[PDB]
PDB file of N, CA and C in Angstrom:
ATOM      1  N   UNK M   1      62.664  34.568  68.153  1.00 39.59           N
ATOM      2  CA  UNK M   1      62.970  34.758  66.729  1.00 39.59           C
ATOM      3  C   UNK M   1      61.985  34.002  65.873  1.00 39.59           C
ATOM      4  N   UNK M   2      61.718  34.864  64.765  1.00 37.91           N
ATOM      5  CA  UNK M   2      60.831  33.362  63.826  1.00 37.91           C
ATOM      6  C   UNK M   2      61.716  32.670  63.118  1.00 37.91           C
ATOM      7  N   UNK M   3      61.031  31.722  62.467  1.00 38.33           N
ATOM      8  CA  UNK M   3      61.906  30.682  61.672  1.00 38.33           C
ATOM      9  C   UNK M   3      62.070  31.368  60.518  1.00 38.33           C
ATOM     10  N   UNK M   4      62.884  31.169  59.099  1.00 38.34           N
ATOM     11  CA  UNK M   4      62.933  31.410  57.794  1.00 38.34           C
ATOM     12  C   UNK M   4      62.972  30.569  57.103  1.00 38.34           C
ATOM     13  N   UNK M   5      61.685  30.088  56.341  1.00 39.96           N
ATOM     14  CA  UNK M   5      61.667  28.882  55.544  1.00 39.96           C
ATOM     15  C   UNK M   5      62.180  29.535  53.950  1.00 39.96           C
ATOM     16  N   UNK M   6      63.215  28.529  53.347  1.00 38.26           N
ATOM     17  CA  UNK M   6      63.663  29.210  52.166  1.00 38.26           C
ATOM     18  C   UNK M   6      62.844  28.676  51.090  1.00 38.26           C
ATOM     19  N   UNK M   7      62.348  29.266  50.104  1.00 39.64           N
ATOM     20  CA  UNK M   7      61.672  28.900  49.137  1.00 39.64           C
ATOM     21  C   UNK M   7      62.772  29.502  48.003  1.00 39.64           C
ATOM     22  N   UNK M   8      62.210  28.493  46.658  1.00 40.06           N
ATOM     23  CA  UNK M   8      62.876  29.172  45.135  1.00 40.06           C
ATOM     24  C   UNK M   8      61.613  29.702  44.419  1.00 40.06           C
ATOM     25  N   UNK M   9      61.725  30.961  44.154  1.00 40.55           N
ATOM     26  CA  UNK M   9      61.042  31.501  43.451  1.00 40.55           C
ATOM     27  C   UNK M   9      59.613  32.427  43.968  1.00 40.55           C
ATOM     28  N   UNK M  10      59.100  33.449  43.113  1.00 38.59           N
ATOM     29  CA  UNK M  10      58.324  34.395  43.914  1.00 38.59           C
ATOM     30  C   UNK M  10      56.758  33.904  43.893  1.00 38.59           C
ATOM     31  N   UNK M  11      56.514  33.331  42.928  1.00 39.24           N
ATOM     32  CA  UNK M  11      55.409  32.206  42.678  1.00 39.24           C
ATOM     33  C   UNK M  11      55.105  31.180  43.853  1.00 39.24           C
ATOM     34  N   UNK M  12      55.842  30.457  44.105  1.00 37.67           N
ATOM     35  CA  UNK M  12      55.528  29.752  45.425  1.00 37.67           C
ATOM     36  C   UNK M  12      55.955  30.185  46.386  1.00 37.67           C
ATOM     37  N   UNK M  13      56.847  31.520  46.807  1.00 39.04           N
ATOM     38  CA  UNK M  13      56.717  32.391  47.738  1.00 39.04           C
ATOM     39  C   UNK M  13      55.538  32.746  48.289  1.00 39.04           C
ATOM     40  N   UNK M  14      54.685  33.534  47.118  1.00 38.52           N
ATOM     41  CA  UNK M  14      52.940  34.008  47.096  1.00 38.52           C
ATOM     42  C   UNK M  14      52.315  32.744  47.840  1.00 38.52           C
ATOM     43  N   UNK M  15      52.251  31.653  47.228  1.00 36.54           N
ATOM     44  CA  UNK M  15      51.578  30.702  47.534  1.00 36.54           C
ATOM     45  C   UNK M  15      51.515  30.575  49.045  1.00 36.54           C
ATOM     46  N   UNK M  16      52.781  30.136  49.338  1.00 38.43           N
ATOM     47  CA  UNK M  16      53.244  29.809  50.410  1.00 38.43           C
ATOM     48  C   UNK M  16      52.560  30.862  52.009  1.00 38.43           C
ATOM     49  N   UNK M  17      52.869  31.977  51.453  1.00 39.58           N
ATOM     50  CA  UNK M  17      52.471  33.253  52.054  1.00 39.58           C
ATOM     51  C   UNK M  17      50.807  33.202  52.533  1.00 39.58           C
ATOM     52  N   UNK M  18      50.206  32.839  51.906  1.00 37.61           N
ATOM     53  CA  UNK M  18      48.375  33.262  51.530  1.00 37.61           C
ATOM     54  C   UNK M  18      48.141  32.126  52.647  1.00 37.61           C
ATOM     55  N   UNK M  19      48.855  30.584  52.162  1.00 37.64           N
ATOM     56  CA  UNK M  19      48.555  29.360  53.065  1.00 37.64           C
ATOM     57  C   UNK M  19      49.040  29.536  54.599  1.00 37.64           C
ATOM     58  N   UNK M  20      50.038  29.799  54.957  1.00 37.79           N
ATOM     59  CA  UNK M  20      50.462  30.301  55.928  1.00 37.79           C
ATOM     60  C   UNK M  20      49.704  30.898  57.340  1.00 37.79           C
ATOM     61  N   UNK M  21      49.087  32.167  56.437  1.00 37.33           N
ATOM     62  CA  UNK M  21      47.648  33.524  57.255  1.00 37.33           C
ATOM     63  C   UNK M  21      46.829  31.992  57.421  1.00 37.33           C
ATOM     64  N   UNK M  22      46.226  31.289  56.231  1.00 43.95           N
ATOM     65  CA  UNK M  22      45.418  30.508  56.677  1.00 43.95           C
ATOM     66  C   UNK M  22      45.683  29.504  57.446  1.00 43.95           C
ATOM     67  N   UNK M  23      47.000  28.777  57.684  1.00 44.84           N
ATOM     68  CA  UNK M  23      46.747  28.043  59.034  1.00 44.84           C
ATOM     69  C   UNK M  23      47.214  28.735  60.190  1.00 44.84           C
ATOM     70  N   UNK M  24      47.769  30.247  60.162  1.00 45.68           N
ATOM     71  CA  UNK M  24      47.803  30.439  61.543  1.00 45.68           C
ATOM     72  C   UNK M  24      46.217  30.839  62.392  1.00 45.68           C
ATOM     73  N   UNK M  25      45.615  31.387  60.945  1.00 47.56           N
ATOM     74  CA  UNK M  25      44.199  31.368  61.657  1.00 47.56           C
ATOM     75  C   UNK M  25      43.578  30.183  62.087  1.00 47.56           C
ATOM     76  N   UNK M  26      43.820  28.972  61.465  1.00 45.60           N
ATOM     77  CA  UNK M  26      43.217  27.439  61.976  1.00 45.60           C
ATOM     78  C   UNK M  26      43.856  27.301  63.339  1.00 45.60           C
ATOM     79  N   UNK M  27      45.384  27.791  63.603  1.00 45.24           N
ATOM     80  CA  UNK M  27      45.607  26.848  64.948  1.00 45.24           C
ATOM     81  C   UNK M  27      45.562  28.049  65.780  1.00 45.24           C
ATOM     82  N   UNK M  28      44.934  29.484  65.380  1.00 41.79           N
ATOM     83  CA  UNK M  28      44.490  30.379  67.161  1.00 41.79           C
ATOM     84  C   UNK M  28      43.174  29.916  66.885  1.00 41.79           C
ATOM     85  N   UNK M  29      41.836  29.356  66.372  1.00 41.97           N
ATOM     86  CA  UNK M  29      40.709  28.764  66.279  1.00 41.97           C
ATOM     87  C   UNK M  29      40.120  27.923  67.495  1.00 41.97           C
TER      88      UNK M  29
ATOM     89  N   UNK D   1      65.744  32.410  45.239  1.00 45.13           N
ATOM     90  CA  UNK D   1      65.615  31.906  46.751  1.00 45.13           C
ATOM     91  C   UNK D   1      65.745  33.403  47.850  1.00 45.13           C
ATOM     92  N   UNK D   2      64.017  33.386  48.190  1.00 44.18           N
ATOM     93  CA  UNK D   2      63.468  33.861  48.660  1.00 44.18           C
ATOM     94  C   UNK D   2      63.641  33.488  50.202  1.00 44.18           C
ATOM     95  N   UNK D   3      63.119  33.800  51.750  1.00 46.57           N
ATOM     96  CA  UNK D   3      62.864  33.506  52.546  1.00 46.57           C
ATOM     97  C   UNK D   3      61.714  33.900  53.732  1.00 46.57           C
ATOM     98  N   UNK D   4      60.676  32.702  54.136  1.00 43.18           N
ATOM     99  CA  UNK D   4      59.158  33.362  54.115  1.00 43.18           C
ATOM    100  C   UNK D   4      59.659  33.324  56.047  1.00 43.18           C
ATOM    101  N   UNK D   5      59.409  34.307  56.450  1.00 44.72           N
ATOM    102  CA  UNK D   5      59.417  34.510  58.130  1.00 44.72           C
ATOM    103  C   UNK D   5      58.158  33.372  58.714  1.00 44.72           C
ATOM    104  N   UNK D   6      58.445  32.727  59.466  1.00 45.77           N
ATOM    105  CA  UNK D   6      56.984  31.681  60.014  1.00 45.77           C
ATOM    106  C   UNK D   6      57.374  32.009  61.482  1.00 45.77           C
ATOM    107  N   UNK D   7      56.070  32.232  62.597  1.00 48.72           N
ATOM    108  CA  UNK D   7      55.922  32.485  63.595  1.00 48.72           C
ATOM    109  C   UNK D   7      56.350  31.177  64.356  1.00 48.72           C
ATOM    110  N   UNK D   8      55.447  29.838  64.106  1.00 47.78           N
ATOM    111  CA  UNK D   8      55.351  28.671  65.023  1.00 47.78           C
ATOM    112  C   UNK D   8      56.113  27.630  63.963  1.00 47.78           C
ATOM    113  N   UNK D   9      56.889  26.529  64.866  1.00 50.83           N
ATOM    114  CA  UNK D   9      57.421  25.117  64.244  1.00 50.83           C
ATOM    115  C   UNK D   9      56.358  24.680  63.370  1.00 50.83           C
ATOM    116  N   UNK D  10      55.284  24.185  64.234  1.00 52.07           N
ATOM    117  CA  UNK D  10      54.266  23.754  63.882  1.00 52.07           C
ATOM    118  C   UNK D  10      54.036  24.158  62.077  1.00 52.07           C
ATOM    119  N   UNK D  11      53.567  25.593  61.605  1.00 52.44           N
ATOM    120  CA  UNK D  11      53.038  26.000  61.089  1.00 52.44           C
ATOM    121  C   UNK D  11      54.193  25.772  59.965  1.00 52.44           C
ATOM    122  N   UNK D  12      55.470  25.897  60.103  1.00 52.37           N
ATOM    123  CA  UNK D  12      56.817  25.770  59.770  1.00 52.37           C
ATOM    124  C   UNK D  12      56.635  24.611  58.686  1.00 52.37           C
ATOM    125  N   UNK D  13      56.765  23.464  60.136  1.00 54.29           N
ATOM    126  CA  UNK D  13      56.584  21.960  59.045  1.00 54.29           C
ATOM    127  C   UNK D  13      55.897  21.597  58.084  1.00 54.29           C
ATOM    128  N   UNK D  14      54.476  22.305  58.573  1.00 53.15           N
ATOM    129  CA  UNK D  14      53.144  22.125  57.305  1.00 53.15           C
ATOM    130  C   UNK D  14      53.257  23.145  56.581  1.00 53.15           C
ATOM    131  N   UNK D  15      54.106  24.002  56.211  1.00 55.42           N
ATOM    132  CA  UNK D  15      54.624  24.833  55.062  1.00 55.42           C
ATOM    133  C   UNK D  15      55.935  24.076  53.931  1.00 55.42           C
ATOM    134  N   UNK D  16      56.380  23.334  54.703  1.00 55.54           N
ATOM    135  CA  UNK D  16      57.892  22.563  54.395  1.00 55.54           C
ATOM    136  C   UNK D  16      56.846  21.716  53.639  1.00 55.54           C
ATOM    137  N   UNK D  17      56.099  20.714  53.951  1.00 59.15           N
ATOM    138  CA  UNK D  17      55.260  19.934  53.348  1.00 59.15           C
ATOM    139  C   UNK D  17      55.019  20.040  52.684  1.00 59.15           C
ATOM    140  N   UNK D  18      53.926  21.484  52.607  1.00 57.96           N
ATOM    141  CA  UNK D  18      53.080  21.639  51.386  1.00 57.96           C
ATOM    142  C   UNK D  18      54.081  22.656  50.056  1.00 57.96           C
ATOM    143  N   UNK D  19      55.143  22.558  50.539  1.00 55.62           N
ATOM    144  CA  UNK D  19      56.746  23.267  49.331  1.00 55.62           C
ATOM    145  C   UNK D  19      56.825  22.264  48.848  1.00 55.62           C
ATOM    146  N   UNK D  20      57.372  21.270  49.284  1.00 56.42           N
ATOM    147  CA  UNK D  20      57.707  19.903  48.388  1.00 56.42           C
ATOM    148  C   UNK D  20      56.778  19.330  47.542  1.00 56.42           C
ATOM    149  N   UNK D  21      55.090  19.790  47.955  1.00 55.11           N
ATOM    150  CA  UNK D  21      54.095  19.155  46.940  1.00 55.11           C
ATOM    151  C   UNK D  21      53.970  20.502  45.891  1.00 55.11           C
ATOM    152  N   UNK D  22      54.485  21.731  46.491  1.00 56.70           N
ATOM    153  CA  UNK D  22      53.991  22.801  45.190  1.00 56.70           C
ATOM    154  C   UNK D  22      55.772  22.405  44.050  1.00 56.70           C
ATOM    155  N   UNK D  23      56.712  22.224  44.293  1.00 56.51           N
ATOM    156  CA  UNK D  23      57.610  21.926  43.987  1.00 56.51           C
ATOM    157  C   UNK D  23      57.680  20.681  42.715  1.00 56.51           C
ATOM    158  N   UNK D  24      56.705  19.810  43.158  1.00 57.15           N
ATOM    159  CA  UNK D  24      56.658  18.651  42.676  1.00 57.15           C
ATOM    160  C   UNK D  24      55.234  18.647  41.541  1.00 57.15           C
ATOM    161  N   UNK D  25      54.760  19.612  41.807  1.00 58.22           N
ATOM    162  CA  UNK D  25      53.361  19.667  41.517  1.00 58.22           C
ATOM    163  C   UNK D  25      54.339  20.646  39.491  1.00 58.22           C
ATOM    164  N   UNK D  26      54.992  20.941  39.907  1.00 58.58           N
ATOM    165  CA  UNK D  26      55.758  21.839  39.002  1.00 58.58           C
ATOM    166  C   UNK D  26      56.242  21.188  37.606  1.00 58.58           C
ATOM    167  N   UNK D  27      56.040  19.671  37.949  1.00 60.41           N
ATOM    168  CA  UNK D  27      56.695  18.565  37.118  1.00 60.41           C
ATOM    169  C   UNK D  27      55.708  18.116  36.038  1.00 60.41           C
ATOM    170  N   UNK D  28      54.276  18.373  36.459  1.00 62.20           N
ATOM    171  CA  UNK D  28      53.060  17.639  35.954  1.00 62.20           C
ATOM    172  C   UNK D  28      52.839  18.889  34.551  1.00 62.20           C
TER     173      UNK D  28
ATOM    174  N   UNK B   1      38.055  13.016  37.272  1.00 69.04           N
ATOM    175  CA  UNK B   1      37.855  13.081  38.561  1.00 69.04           C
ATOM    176  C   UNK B   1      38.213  12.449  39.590  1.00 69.04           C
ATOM    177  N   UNK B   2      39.119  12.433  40.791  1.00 66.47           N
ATOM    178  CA  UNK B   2      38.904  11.758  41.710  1.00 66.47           C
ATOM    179  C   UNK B   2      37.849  12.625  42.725  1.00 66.47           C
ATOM    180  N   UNK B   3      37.902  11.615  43.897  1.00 67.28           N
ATOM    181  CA  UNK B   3      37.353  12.478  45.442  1.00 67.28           C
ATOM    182  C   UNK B   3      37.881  12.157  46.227  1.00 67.28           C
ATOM    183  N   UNK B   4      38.145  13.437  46.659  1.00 65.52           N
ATOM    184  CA  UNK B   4      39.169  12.946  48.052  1.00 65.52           C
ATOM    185  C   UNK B   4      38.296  13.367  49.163  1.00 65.52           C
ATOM    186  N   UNK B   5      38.254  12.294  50.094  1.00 61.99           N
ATOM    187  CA  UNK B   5      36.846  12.314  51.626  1.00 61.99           C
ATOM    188  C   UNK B   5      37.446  13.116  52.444  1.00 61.99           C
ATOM    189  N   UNK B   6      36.899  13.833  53.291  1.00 63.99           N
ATOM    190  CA  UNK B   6      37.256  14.726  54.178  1.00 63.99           C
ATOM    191  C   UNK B   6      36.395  14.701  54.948  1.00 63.99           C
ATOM    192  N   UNK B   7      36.663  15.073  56.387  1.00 63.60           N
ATOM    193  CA  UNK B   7      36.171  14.867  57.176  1.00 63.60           C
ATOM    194  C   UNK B   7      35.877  16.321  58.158  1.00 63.60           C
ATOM    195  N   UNK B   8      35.348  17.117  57.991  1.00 62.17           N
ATOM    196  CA  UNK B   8      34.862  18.303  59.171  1.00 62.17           C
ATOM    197  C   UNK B   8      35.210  19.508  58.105  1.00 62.17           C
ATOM    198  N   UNK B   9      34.645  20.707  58.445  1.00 63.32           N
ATOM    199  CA  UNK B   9      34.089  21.863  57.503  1.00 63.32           C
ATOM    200  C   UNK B   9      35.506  22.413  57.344  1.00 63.32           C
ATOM    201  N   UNK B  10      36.261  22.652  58.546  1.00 60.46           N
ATOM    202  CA  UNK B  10      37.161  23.155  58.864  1.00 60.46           C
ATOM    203  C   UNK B  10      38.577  22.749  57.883  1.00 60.46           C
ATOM    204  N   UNK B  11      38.694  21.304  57.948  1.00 63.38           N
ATOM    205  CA  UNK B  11      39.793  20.466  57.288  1.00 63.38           C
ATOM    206  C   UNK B  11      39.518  20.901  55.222  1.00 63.38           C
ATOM    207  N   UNK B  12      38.175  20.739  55.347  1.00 59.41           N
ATOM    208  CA  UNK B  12      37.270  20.660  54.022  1.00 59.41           C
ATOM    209  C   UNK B  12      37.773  21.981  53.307  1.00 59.41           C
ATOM    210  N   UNK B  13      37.818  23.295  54.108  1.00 62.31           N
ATOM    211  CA  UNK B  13      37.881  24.438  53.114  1.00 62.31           C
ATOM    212  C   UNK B  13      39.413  24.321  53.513  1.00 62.31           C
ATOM    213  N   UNK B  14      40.232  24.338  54.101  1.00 63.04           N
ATOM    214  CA  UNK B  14      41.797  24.244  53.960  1.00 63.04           C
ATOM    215  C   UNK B  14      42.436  23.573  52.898  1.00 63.04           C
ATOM    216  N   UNK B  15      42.296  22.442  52.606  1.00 64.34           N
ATOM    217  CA  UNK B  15      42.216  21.264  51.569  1.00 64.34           C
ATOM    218  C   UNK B  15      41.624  22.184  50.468  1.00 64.34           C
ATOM    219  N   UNK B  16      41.057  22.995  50.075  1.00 65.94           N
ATOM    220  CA  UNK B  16      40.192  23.519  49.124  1.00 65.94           C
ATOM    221  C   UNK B  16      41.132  24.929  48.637  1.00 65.94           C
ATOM    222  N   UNK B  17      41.660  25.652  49.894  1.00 66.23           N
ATOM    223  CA  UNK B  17      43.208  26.632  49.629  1.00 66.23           C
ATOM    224  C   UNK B  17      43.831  26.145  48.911  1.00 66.23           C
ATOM    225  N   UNK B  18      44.179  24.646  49.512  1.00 66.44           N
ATOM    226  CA  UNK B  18      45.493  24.348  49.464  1.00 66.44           C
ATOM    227  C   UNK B  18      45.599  23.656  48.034  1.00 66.44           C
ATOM    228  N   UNK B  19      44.680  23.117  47.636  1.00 66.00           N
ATOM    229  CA  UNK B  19      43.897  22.355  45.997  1.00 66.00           C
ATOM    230  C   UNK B  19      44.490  23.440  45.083  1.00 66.00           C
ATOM    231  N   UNK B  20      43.908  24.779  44.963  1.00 68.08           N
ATOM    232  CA  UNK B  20      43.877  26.126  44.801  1.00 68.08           C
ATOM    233  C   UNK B  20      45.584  25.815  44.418  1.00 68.08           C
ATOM    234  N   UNK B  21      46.327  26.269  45.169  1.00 62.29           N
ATOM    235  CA  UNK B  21      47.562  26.562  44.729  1.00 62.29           C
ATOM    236  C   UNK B  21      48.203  25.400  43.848  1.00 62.29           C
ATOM    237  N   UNK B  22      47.905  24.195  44.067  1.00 61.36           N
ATOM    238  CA  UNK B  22      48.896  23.158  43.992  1.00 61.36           C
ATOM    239  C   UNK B  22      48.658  23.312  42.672  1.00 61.36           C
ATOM    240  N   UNK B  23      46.984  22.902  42.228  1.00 60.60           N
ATOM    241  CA  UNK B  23      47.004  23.367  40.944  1.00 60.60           C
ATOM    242  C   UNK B  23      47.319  24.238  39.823  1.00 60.60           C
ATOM    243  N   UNK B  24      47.368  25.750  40.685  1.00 63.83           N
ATOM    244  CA  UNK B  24      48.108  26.769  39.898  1.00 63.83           C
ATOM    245  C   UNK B  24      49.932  26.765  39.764  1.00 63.83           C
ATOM    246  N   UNK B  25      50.310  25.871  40.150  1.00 63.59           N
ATOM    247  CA  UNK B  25      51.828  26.010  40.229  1.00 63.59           C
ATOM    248  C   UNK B  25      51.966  24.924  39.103  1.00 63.59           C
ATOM    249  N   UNK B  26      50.977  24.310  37.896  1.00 62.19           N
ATOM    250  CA  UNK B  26      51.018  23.843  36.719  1.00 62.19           C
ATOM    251  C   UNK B  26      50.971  24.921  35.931  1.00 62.19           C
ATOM    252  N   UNK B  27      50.673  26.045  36.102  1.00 61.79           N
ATOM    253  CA  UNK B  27      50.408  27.507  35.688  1.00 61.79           C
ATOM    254  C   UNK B  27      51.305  28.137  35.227  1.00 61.79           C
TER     255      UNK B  27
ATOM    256  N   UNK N   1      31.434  13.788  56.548  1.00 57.27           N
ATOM    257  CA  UNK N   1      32.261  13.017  55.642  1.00 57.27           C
ATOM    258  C   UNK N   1      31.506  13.749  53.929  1.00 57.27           C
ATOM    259  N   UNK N   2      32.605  14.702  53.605  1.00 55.63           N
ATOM    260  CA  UNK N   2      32.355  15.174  52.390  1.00 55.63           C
ATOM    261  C   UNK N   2      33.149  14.655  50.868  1.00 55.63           C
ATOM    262  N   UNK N   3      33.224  14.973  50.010  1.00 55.66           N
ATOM    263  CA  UNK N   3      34.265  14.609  49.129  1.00 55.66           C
ATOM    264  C   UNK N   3      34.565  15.978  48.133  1.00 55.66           C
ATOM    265  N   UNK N   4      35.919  16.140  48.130  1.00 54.54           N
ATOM    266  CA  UNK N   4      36.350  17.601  47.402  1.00 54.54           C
ATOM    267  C   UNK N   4      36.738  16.632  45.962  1.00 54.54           C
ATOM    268  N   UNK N   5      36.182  17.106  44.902  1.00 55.29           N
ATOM    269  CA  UNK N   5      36.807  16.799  43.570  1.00 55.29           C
ATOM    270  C   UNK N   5      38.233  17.366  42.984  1.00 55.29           C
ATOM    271  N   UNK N   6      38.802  16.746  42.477  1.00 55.50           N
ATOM    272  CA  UNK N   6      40.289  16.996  42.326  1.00 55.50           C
ATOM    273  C   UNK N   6      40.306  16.071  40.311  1.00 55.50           C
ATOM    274  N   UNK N   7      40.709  17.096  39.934  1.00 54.51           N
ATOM    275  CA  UNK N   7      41.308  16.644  38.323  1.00 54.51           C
ATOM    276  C   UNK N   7      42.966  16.058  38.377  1.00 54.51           C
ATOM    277  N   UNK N   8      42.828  14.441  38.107  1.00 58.29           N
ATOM    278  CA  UNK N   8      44.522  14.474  38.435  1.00 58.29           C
ATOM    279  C   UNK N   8      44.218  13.326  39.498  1.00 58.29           C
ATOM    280  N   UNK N   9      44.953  12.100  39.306  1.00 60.59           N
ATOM    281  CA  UNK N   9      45.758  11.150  40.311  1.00 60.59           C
ATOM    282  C   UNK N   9      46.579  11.513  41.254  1.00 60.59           C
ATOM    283  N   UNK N  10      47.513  12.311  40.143  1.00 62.42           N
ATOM    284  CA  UNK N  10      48.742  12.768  41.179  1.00 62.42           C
ATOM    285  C   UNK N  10      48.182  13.769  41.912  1.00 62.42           C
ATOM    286  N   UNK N  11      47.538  14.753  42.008  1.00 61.39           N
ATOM    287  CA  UNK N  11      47.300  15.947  42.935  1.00 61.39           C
ATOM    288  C   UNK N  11      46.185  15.183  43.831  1.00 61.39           C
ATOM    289  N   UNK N  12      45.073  14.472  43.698  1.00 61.60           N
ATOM    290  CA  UNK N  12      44.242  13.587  44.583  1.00 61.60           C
ATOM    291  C   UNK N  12      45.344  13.055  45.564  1.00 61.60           C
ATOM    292  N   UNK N  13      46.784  12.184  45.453  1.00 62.13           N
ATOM    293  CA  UNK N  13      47.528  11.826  46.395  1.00 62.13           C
ATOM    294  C   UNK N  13      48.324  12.687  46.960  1.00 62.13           C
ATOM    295  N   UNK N  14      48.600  13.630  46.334  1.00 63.53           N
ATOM    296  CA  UNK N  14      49.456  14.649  46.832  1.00 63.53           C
ATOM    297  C   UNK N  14      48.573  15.132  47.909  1.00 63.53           C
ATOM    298  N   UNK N  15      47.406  15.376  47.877  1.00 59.16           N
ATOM    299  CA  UNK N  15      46.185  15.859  48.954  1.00 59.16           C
ATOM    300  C   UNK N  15      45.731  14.683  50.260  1.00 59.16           C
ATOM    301  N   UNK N  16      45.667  14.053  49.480  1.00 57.59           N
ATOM    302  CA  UNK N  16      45.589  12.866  50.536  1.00 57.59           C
ATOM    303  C   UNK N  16      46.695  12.849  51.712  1.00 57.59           C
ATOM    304  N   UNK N  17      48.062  13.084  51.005  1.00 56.66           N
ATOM    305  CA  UNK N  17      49.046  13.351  52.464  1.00 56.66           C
ATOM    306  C   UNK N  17      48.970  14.483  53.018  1.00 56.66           C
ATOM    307  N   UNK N  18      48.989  15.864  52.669  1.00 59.02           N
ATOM    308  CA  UNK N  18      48.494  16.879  53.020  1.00 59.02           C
ATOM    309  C   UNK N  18      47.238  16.880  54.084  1.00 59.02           C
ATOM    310  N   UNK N  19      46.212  16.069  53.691  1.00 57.41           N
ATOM    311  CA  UNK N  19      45.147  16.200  54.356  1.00 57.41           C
ATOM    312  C   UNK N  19      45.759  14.980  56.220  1.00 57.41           C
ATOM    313  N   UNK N  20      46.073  14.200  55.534  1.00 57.44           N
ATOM    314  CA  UNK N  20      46.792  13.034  57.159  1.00 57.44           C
ATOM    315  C   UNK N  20      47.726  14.077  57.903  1.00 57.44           C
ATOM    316  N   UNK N  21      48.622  14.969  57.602  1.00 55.91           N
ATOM    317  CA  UNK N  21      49.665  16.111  58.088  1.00 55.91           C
ATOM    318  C   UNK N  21      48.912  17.086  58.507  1.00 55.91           C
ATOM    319  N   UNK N  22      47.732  17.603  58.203  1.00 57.05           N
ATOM    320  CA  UNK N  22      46.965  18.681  58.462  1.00 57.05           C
ATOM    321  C   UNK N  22      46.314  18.136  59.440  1.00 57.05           C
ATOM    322  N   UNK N  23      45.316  16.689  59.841  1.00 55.46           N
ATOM    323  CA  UNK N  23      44.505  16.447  60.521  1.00 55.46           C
ATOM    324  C   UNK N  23      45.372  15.933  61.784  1.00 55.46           C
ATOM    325  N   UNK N  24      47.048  15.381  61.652  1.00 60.58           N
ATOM    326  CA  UNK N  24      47.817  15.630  62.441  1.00 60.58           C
ATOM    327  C   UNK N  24      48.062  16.717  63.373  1.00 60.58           C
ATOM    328  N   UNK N  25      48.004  17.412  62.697  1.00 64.25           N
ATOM    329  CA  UNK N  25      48.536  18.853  63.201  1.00 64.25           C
ATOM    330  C   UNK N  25      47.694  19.341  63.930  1.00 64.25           C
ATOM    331  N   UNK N  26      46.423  19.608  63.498  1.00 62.52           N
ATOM    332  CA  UNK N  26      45.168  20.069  64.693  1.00 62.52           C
ATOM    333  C   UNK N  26      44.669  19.206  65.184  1.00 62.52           C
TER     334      UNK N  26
END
């Protein structure tokens, strides 16, 4: 299962989202 | 209150982290 | 200005994402 | 050993832990 991290709001949803792609690409690297 | 799917713990925690600094960052 | 030191290319542009948002969530 | 410029005290420390959690992590 994956985890579900809860965030407030769609603004740091986005954020959250973009950073995410970028460290899963750092830790298959 | 949204909820973002995360694959690894790992990646999990350093998302939890960097929430509390976008969270806080909200204040300035 | 501050500077914050960093250490390897890798750490350098992550820190540089992550700058990116923190700042826009004053936005 | 580079240095990223940052406008702001508070977001320079806010990065500073970010960056110790990140260099943790990998």
């Amino acid at each position: 299962e994956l985890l579900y991290l809860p965030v407030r709001g769609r603004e740091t949803y986005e954020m959250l989202l973009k950073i995410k792609e970028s460290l899963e690409l750092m830790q298959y690297l």
